From a paper:
Ferrous GLB-1 binds O2 with a high affinity and is pentacoordinated in the absence of exogenous heme ligands. The tertiary structure of GLB-1* conforms to the three-over-three α-helical sandwich of the classical globin fold, where the seven/eight helices building up the globin fold are conventionally labelled, A, B..., H, according to their sequential order (topological sites are numbered sequentially within each helix;).
The diffraction data collected at 2.8 Å resolution on GLB-1* crystals grown in the trigonal P3121 space group (two molecules per asymmetric unit) were also refined, yielding Rfactor and Rfree values of 26.9% and 31.9%, respectively, with ideal stereochemical parameters. Superposition of 158 Cα atoms of the two independent molecules, in the trigonal crystal form, yielded a rmsd of 0.53 Å. Comparison of the GLB-1* structures from the tetragonal and trigonal crystal forms yielded rmsd of 0.53 Å and 0.42 Å, for 158 Cα atoms, depending on the chains superposed. The only backbone differences observed in the two crystal forms are located at the N- and C-terminal residues of the polypeptide chain (residues 2 and 159, respectively), and at residues 124-126 of the GH hinge. The crystallographic dimer is identical to the quaternary assembly found in the trigonal crystal form, where two crystallographically independent GLB-1* chains fill the asymmetric unit. The rmsd calculated over the whole dimer in the two crystal forms is 0.50 Å. The dimerization interface observed for the GLB-1 dimer is tightly packed, the stability of the assembly being granted by several hydrophobic interactions, hydrogen bonds (also mediated by water molecules and, in the trigonal crystal form, also by sulphate ions) and salt bridges.
Residue numbers in the entry:
A (entry chain A), B (entry chain B): 2 to 159
Write the structure that this text describes.
Amino acid sequence: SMNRQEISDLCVKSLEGRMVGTEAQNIENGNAFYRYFFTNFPDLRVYFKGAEKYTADDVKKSERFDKQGQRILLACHLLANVYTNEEVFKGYVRETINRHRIYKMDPALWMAFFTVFTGYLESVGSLNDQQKAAWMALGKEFNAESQTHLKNSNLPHV
Amino acid sequence: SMNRQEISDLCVKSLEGRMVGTEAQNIENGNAFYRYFFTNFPDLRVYFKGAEKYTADDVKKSERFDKQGQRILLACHLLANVYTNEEVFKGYVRETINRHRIYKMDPALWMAFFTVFTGYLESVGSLNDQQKAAWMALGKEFNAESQTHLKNSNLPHV
Ligand code: HEM
Ligand code: HEM
């Protein structure tokens, strides 16, 4: 069924209630991702040097994660809104990968994120099998390129 | 006049001859921008540490601007592609301003950059008045949120 264009629409809709901004509610969506991420996937807190043991409250009243939650949420809207333009989509992912090499992540998490993120959108407002499948379509596309680039950069890949 | 969808389309089309990628051709599309930048706006070389006196040959033989070129070009691609979504656009502008805090730039250069970009586009190939005015409408929005963000961030602004 799913072509480049249809995936986008789907993904963008999922996020239309989780819009980025400068206001309290806009800052909440950002912060809330890490609250959920840290609660249910606490073993990945390692990469977050110093936040490696943060409880849901520590993140809630933090400014590091009000900055970092706003950055991740703005990244995820970016992926949804440019997916239609393949070469640029692949471009952005390569940049994501580069700015992540410093933490030297486990090269399977590039898939895992969308479990967390769909699991986060499924935790805040609403979702569906069509939307969640599009995110996974974007994920396969993300990881598809993410590995190609990891093996291209002489780096740990699967 | 002209609208968000109209701008998007014109701004994107003008960029198909300067696409991002891993091949030799794509990598120079970012590189040639700096070769242009430095050859026509030398007084702005001050920002690029170590590269304040660099030439076209210096930039060409540099693997630093190969990295750095793809980044600015990608950034401008994402700008053209997400323009239809205003909040995601505003978000990416605030983020761009954030990532430029360290250089403490002349706040007037946020408008000025697009003059340079269309300048580059015309040096490379085809760029019509509609394509040029579209970028100029896009820039007038980028800059608008630039100064707004810097204002409520306690940093200098025009
Ligand atoms: C699920 C696997 C991931 C892990 C373990 C991870 C981990 C991290 C960590 C530890 C940081 C730095 C936080 C700090 O020290 O303050 C970071 C930054 C960041 N991450 Fe991720 N991340 C993951 C997935 C992603 C994905 C898929 C995206 C793209 C949508 C992304 C986008 C970003 C952005 C935009 C930043 C900060 C700004 C930048 O470096 O450009 N992350 N990440
Ligand atoms: C004439 C105005 C501008 C100047 C003088 C300028 C200057 C710089 C400098 C000094 C760097 C550091 C890179 C290095 O040292 O190798 C940089 C990186 C970068 N610039 Fe700009 N910039 C300008 C406008 C813009 C605009 C409008 C954008 C938005 C598309 C942008 C996007 C970026 C990006 C994405 C990077 C890569 C590093 C990062 O993301 O933090 N720049 N720029």
